[PDB]
Amino acid sequence: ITGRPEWIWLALGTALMGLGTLYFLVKGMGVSDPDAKKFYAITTLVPAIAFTMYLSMLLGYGLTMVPFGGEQNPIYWARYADWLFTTPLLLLDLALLVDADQGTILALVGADGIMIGTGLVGALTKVYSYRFVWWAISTAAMLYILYVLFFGFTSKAESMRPEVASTFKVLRNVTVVLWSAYPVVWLIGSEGAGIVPLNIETLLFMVLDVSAKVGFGLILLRSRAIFGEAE
Amino acid sequence: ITGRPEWIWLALGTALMGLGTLYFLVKGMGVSDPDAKKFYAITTLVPAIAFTMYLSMLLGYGLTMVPFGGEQNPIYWARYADWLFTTPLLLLDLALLVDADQGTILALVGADGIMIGTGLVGALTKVYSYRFVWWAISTAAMLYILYVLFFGFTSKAESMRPEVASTFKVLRNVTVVLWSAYPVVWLIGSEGAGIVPLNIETLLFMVLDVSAKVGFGLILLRSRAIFGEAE
Amino acid sequence: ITGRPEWIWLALGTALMGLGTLYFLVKGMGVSDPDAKKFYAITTLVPAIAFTMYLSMLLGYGLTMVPFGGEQNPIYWARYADWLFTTPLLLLDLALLVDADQGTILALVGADGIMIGTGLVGALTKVYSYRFVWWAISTAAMLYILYVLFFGFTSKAESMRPEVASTFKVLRNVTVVLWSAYPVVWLIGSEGAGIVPLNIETLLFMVLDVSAKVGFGLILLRSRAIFGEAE
Ligand SMILES: CC(C)CCC[C@@H](C)CCC[C@@H](C)CCC[C@@H](C)CCOC[C@@H](CO)OCC[C@H](C)CCC[C@H](C)CCC[C@H](C)CCCC(C)C
Ligand SMILES: CC(C)CCC[C@@H](C)CCC[C@@H](C)CCC[C@@H](C)CCOC[C@@H](CO)OCC[C@H](C)CCC[C@H](C)CCC[C@H](C)CCCC(C)C
Ligand SMILES: CC(C)CCC[C@@H](C)CCC[C@@H](C)CCC[C@@H](C)CCOC[C@@H](CO)OCC[C@H](C)CCC[C@H](C)CCC[C@H](C)CCCC(C)C
Ligand SMILES: *C/C=C(C)/C=C/C=C(C)/C=C/C1=C(C)CCCC1(C)C
Ligand SMILES: *C/C=C(C)/C=C/C=C(C)/C=C/C1=C(C)CCCC1(C)C
Ligand SMILES: *C/C=C(C)/C=C/C=C(C)/C=C/C1=C(C)CCCC1(C)C
Ligand SMILES: CCCCCCCCCCCCCCC
Ligand SMILES: CCCCCCCCCCCCCCC
Ligand SMILES: CCCCCCCCCCCCCCC
Ligand SMILES: CCCCCCCCCCCCCCC
Ligand SMILES: CCCCCCCCCCCCCCC
Ligand SMILES: CCCCCCCCCCCCCCC
Ligand SMILES: CCCCCCCCCCCCCC
Ligand SMILES: CCCCCCCCCCCCCC
Ligand SMILES: CCCCCCCCCCCCC
Ligand SMILES: CCCCCCCCCCCCC
Ligand SMILES: CCCCCCCCCCCCC
Ligand SMILES: CCCCCCCCCCC
Ligand SMILES: CCCCCCCCCCC
Ligand SMILES: CCCCCCCCCCC
Ligand SMILES: CCCCCCCCCC
Ligand SMILES: CCCCCCCCCC
Ligand SMILES: CCCCCCCCCC
Ligand SMILES: CCCCCCCCC
Ligand SMILES: CCCCCCCCC
Ligand SMILES: CCCCCCCCC
Ligand SMILES: CCCCCCCC
Ligand SMILES: CCCCCCCC
Ligand SMILES: CCCCCCCC
Ligand SMILES: CCCCCCCC
Ligand SMILES: CCCCCCCC
Ligand SMILES: CCCCCCCC
Ligand SMILES: CCCCCCCC
C-alpha cells in the first residue's frame, strides 16, 4: 500500500466515504415519509458505492497499467466503475426533486452513461492522440447534461413549492461547478497531458468526490424539500 | 486504421450513426408533449450509443483476437456492447407504443439480454463446436421475442388508436425482418462457419444496423402516434 | 469437461435449471391477469439466467485461475454474473408481493449489488488476507438486506390480504435460511479457507441455487397471492 505516494489520499477518501455512509444511514433511520425515503435511499447508496471503490484503489485492486507515450502508466480504472453508478444516482436526486418527466430522466441517465463510458475508453486507449478524441466526446455529453439542468429543470423548479425550488437551485449550482472540474483534472493529469503528477491528481479527485457526494448529500438531506407537504 | 480492409464500412457506419443522432437531436428540440419526449429520448440514444461503438471499432479498440480453428480470429466485441443497450431500447419504443404491461416489458428485456449475452459468449468461445451451442440458445431467445411481438402486442395494438396501430404494425414488420438477418450473418461470417469474409460481413452488419436504428427512428418520429390525443 | 471432478454437479445444475425454466414457461402460458404476469416474468427469468451460467461453467468458459497461497486456484467467476442479476430479481418478487415503496426497493437492490460486487472482488483478489476483508463487507450488505426483509416488510405484509401475508412469510423464511448459507460455503470453500474441496463446494452451491430459485418459484407461482382480488 504505502509504496504508492498517493496512498494517503486514497485512505482519506475511503474513511470520509465510509463515515458519510454511516451518518446518512443513521440519520435515515427515523424516516417514514415515502417521499423522504426515496431521497435517503438514493443519497446513502452514493457514498457506499464510492467507499468500496476507494477501498479497491487503496488495496491495489482497482489499478492497472496502460502503455502509452512509451511508458507503463498507472491508471485507476475503479474510478469509472464508481462514477458509472453514482453519477446517475446523483442526477436522479435532482430530477425527482423537480418531478421531472420520464423522457427527460432517460435522456440524462443515457447521456451520463455515454459520458462515463467514453471516459473509460479514453483512459484505457493505447494510442496517445486518440485518448483526447474520447475526452472530447465525453465532454460533449457532459455539456448536454449541464444544458438540461439549466434550460429544462430550472424552469420546472420555479413552478414548484418554494423550498424545493430554492434547494434545487443550490444543488444545481454545486453540481455544475464541481462536475465541470473533473474533465479538467483528467486532461492535465496522468490520464491526459501528464502536467500534474498522479499523487496531486489523486488529491484533487478526492476533494471533488467528497464534496460532490457527501457535501451534496448533507445539503439535500437537511432540506425540507424531501418531505411531502403534510399537516 | 486503413490496414484493415473493413475500415471503409466502419467509417461509413460511424458517419451515418453520428448524422442520425444529430438529426434526431435537432428534430426533438421543439417538442413539449411528455409522451413524445419519451420516444425522442429513447430513439435518439440508440444511434448515439451505436456511434460510439462504431468509432471504437474504427480506431481498433473494440477488436480482439480469439484462437479457434488453429487461427487467431479477429472478433469485434464492441458490437455486443452496442447491442446490449440499443436492442432493449428499441423494444421499449415498441412496447410503449402499444402501452404494454410491465410484466411483458420485463420478459422482453430479459430475453433480449440473454440473446445478446449468449451471443457474446459464443463469439469469445475457443472450442469451435461450442460456439454454435451458444448461437442456438441465443436464437431461441430471439424467437421468443419475435413470438411476443406477434402474438401479444399485435392484438394489443388493434384495441388502440388507429394511428398507433398502423405505425406499430409497420415498425413490427421492419423489426422482425431485420433482426432475423443478424443470426444468419453471424453463422456464415467470421464468428461462425467463415464462409463470408470479414470485410463483407462488416458491410452487412452496417446496412442492418443503420436500417434497424436510423431507418426505424425516421419512421417512428415522423408518426403522429407518439403524441397524445390533444385538441 | 469430465476432466474436472465437479463436472457432475455442474451438469445436474444445468439440467435442473433448464427443466425449471421450461415448467414455469409452460405454466405461465395460460395467464392474463396483469399482476400475475409480473410474477411469472420475474420468476421465469431467474432459472433461465442461471441455466446459461451453469452451462458456461460446465463447458469451462466461466472458470479462471487466480494465484494466491502460492497456487493457481480455480475460481468459477460465472457464479457472480448469475447472482448479479438473479438475486435482485428474487428480491423484487418479495417486494412486489408486499407492495413495498420505491425507496425501499432501491435500497434493497443497491445493497444487493454491493453484496455481489464485493464478493466478486474478494474472489479475484490475489492478496490472501484481503479476500476476507471483501467477504466481511459483502456479509454486512447481506445483513442489511435480511434486516429489511424482517423489520420493514413483515410489518407491511400483515396489513395486506391474508393470502399474500402467509405466502410472503413462507418465502421470507426460505430466503433468509438459504441465502445465509452462501457466505458460509464461500468462507470454508476454495474461495476462502480451503477446508472443503471444490467438488463438494460445487455440490453445495448447486443444492442452494436450485432450492433458492426453482423451489422458491414453485411456492410462489402456486399461490393465489400473485393474482389480484377479482370476482
Ligand atoms: C443507456 C446507457 C446506460 C447507455 C450506456 C452508454 C455506453 C454504451 C457508452 C459506451 C460504453 C462502452 C465503452 C463500455 C466499454 C467497457 C469496457 C471498457 C470493458 C473493458 O474492456 C475493454 C478491453 C480492455 O481494455 O477489453 C478487452 C477485450 C475483452 C475480450 C472484452 C470482452 C468483454 C466486453 C467488454 C463485453 C461488453 C460488456 C459491456 C460493455 C458491459 C457494460 C460496461 C459499462 C462500462 C457500460
Ligand atoms: C435481466 C437481463 C438483463 C439478464 C441478462 C442476461 C445475462 C445473464 C445473459 C448472460 C450474460 C453473461 C454471459 C455475460 C458475460 C460477460 C463476459 C463476456 C465479460 C468478459 O469476460 C469473459 C472472459 C473472457 O472471455 O473473462 C475472463 C475472466 C475474467 C476474470 C472475468 C471476471 C469478470 C466477470 C465478467 C464479472 C461479471 C460481470 C457481469 C457479467 C457484467 C455484465 C456484462 C453484460 C455482458 C451482461
Ligand atoms: C446500484 C447498484 C447496482 C450499485 C452496484 C454496486 C457496485 C458498485 C459494487 C462494486 C462493483 C465492482 C467491484 C465491480 C467490479 C467488476 C470487475 C470485477 C470486472 C473485472 O475486472 C477486474 C479486474 C481483473 O480482476 O480487471 C482488470 C483490469 C481491467 C482493465 C478492468 C477495466 C474494465 C472495468 C471493470 C470497467 C468497469 C465496468 C463496471 C464495473 C461494469 C459493472 C460490473 C458489475 C460486476 C457491477
Ligand atoms: C462522485 C463523482 C462524480 C460526481 C464524478 C463526476 C465525473 C465527471 C463529471 C467526469 C467527467 C469526464 C469528462 C467530462 C471527460 C473526461 C473524463 C471524465 C470521465 C473525467
Ligand atoms: C441495432 C442493432 C440491432 C437491432 C441488433 C440486433 C441483433 C440481433 C437480433 C442478434 C442476434 C444474434 C443471434 C440471434 C444469435 C447469433 C448472435 C447474435 C447476437 C448476432
Ligand atoms: C440464486 C442465487 C442466490 C440466491 C445467491 C445468493 C448469494 C449470496 C446471498 C451470496 C453471498 C455472499 C456473501 C454474503 C459474502 C461472501 C460472498 C457471497 C457473494 C457468496
Ligand atoms: C480544476 C482544478 C485544476 C487546477 C490544478 C492546479 C494544480 C496546481 C498544483 C501544482 C502543480 C504541480 C506541478 C509541479 C509538480
Ligand atoms: C451536523 C452536520 C455534520 C455531520 C457530520 C458529517 C460527517 C461526515 C463527513 C463530512 C465531511 C465532508 C463534508 C463536505 C466538505
Ligand atoms: C441475410 C443475408 C445473408 C446473405 C449473404 C450474401 C453474401 C453474398 C456475398 C458473396 C459471398 C462472398 C464469398 C466469396 C468471397
Ligand atoms: C427528411 C427525412 C430525411 C432526413 C435526413 C436523415 C439523414 C440521416 C441519415 C439517414 C440515412 C439512412 C436512412 C435509412 C436507410
Ligand atoms: C452451510 C453448510 C456448510 C456445511 C459444510 C459441511 C461439509 C461437510 C462435508 C465433509 C467435509 C469434507 C472434508 C474432508 C474432505
Ligand atoms: C407439480 C409440481 C412439480 C412440477 C415439476 C417441477 C420440475 C422442476 C424441477 C424441480 C426440482 C427441484 C425442486 C426444488 C427441490
Ligand atoms: C449503466 C448503468 C446505469 C444504471 C445506473 C443505476 C441508476 C439507474 C437510474 C434509473 C432512473 C430511472 C429511469 C426511469
Ligand atoms: C443488461 C442491460 C439492460 C438494460 C438496458 C437499458 C434499457 C432498460 C429498459 C428498461 C425498461 C423498463 C422495464 C420496467
Ligand atoms: C452549455 C450549457 C451551459 C451550462 C454549462 C456550463 C459549461 C461549463 C464549462 C465546463 C468546461 C469543461 C471543459
Ligand atoms: C415463432 C414466432 C413466429 C415469428 C418469428 C419468425 C421467425 C423468423 C425466423 C428467423 C430465422 C433465424 C435463424
Ligand atoms: C440482523 C438482522 C436479523 C436477521 C438476520 C439473520 C442473521 C443470520 C446470520 C447469517 C450468518 C452469515 C455469516
Ligand atoms: C497528441 C495531441 C494530438 C491532438 C489531438 C486533439 C484532439 C482533440 C479533439 C477535440 C475536437
Ligand atoms: C463443428 C460442428 C459441430 C456441430 C454442432 C452443432 C450444434 C448446433 C446445436 C443446435 C441444436
Ligand atoms: C490470513 C488471515 C488474516 C485474517 C484477516 C481477517 C479479516 C476479517 C475482517 C472481519 C472484520
Ligand atoms: C469507519 C471508519 C472507516 C475507516 C477505514 C478505512 C480507512 C483506511 C485506514 C488504513
Ligand atoms: C458529423 C460527421 C461525423 C463524421 C466523423 C466520423 C467519420 C470518420 C471519418 C474518418
Ligand atoms: C431440457 C434438458 C436440458 C439438459 C441439457 C443440459 C444437461 C447437460 C448434459 C451433458
Ligand atoms: C460543496 C461544499 C459542501 C459544503 C457541505 C456543508 C453543508 C452543511 C449543511
Ligand atoms: C427499413 C428501411 C427504412 C427506410 C427509411 C426511410 C423512412 C423515410 C420516412
Ligand atoms: C426450499 C425447499 C423448497 C421445496 C419445493 C417444493 C415446493 C412444492 C410446492
Ligand atoms: C446561491 C447558492 C450558491 C451555491 C454555489 C456554491 C458553489 C460551490
Ligand atoms: C458555471 C461555473 C463553471 C465553473 C468551472 C470551474 C472549472 C474548474
Ligand atoms: C443534421 C442537422 C439537421 C438540420 C435540421 C433538419 C430540420 C429539422
Ligand atoms: C405493411 C408495411 C410493410 C413493411 C415491411 C418492410 C420490410 C422491409
Ligand atoms: C418474417 C419474414 C422473415 C424474413 C427473414 C429474412 C432473413 C434474411
Ligand atoms: C412457516 C414456514 C416455514 C418455512 C421454513 C422452511 C425452511 C427451509
Ligand atoms: C434464521 C435462521 C438462520 C439459519 C442459518 C443457517 C446457516 C447455515
Coordinates of N, CA and C in Angstrom, one line a residue, chain A residues 1 25 29 34 37-39 41-42 45 48-49 51-53 55-57 59-61 89 92, chain C residues 101-104 106-107 109-111 114 118 120-121 124-127 130 133-134 137 144 147:
Chain A
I1 N 0.8 -1.2 0.0 CA 0.0 0.0 0.0 C 0.9 1.2 0.0
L25 N -26.9 6.8 6.9 CA -27.7 5.6 7.3 C -28.4 5.8 8.7
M29 N -32.8 6.5 9.7 CA -33.5 5.5 10.5 C -34.9 6.0 10.8
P34 N -42.8 8.4 2.6 CA -42.4 7.6 1.4 C -41.5 8.4 0.5
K37 N -38.0 8.8 2.0 CA -37.3 7.5 2.0 C -36.6 7.3 0.6
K38 N -37.2 7.8 -0.5 CA -36.6 7.8 -1.8 C -35.3 8.5 -1.8
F39 N -35.3 9.8 -1.3 CA -34.0 10.6 -1.3 C -33.0 10.0 -0.4
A41 N -32.6 6.8 0.3 CA -32.0 5.6 -0.3 C -31.0 5.9 -1.4
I42 N -31.4 6.9 -2.3 CA -30.5 7.3 -3.3 C -29.2 7.9 -2.8
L45 N -26.8 5.4 -0.9 CA -26.1 4.5 -1.8 C -24.8 5.1 -2.4
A48 N -21.7 4.9 -0.3 CA -21.5 3.5 0.0 C -20.8 2.8 -1.2
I49 N -21.2 3.1 -2.4 CA -20.5 2.6 -3.6 C -19.1 3.2 -3.7
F51 N -17.3 4.3 -1.3 CA -16.4 3.7 -0.3 C -15.8 2.4 -0.8
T52 N -16.5 1.5 -1.5 CA -16.0 0.3 -1.9 C -14.9 0.5 -3.0
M53 N -15.1 1.4 -3.9 CA -14.2 1.6 -5.0 C -12.9 2.4 -4.5
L55 N -11.7 1.9 -1.5 CA -11.0 0.8 -0.8 C -10.3 -0.1 -1.9
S56 N -10.9 -0.4 -3.0 CA -10.3 -1.2 -4.0 C -9.0 -0.5 -4.6
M57 N -9.1 0.8 -4.7 CA -7.9 1.5 -5.1 C -6.8 1.5 -4.1
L59 N -6.2 -0.8 -1.8 CA -5.6 -2.1 -1.7 C -5.0 -2.5 -3.0
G60 N -5.0 -1.7 -4.0 CA -4.3 -2.0 -5.3 C -5.1 -2.8 -6.3
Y61 N -6.4 -3.2 -6.0 CA -7.2 -4.0 -7.0 C -7.7 -3.1 -8.1
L89 N -27.2 8.2 -10.1 CA -28.0 8.4 -8.9 C -28.0 9.8 -8.4
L92 N -30.5 11.5 -10.5 CA -31.9 11.1 -10.1 C -32.4 11.9 -8.9
Chain C
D101 N -42.6 0.2 -1.0 CA -42.4 1.6 -1.6 C -41.1 1.6 -2.4
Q102 N -41.1 2.6 -3.3 CA -39.9 2.6 -4.2 C -38.6 2.8 -3.5
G103 N -38.6 3.7 -2.5 CA -37.3 3.9 -1.8 C -36.8 2.7 -1.2
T104 N -37.6 1.8 -0.6 CA -37.2 0.6 0.0 C -36.7 -0.4 -1.1
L106 N -35.3 0.4 -3.9 CA -33.9 0.8 -4.4 C -32.9 0.5 -3.4
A107 N -33.2 0.6 -2.1 CA -32.2 0.3 -1.1 C -31.8 -1.2 -1.1
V109 N -32.1 -3.4 -3.7 CA -31.4 -3.7 -5.0 C -30.0 -3.2 -4.9
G110 N -29.8 -2.0 -4.4 CA -28.4 -1.4 -4.3 C -27.6 -2.1 -3.3
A111 N -28.1 -2.5 -2.1 CA -27.3 -3.3 -1.2 C -27.0 -4.6 -1.8
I114 N -24.1 -4.3 -4.1 CA -22.8 -4.2 -3.3 C -22.4 -5.5 -2.8
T118 N -18.8 -6.9 -4.2 CA -17.7 -7.1 -3.3 C -17.3 -8.5 -3.2
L120 N -17.4 -10.7 -5.7 CA -16.6 -10.9 -6.9 C -15.2 -10.4 -6.7
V121 N -15.0 -9.2 -6.2 CA -13.7 -8.6 -5.9 C -12.9 -9.5 -5.0
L124 N -11.5 -12.7 -6.7 CA -10.4 -12.4 -7.7 C -9.2 -11.8 -7.0
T125 N -9.3 -11.5 -5.7 CA -8.2 -10.8 -5.1 C -7.0 -11.8 -4.9
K126 N -5.8 -11.3 -5.2 CA -4.6 -12.1 -5.1 C -3.9 -12.1 -3.8
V127 N -4.1 -11.0 -3.0 CA -3.5 -11.0 -1.6 C -4.5 -11.7 -0.7
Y130 N -6.6 -10.1 2.2 CA -7.6 -9.1 1.7 C -8.8 -9.8 1.2
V133 N -11.4 -9.4 3.9 CA -11.9 -8.0 4.0 C -13.1 -7.8 3.2
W134 N -13.1 -8.3 1.9 CA -14.2 -8.2 1.0 C -15.3 -9.1 1.4
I137 N -17.3 -7.1 4.2 CA -18.1 -6.1 3.6 C -19.3 -6.6 2.9
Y144 N -27.8 -6.3 6.1 CA -28.8 -5.2 5.9 C -30.0 -5.6 5.2
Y147 N -32.2 -7.7 7.5 CA -32.9 -6.8 8.4 C -34.1 -6.2 7.8

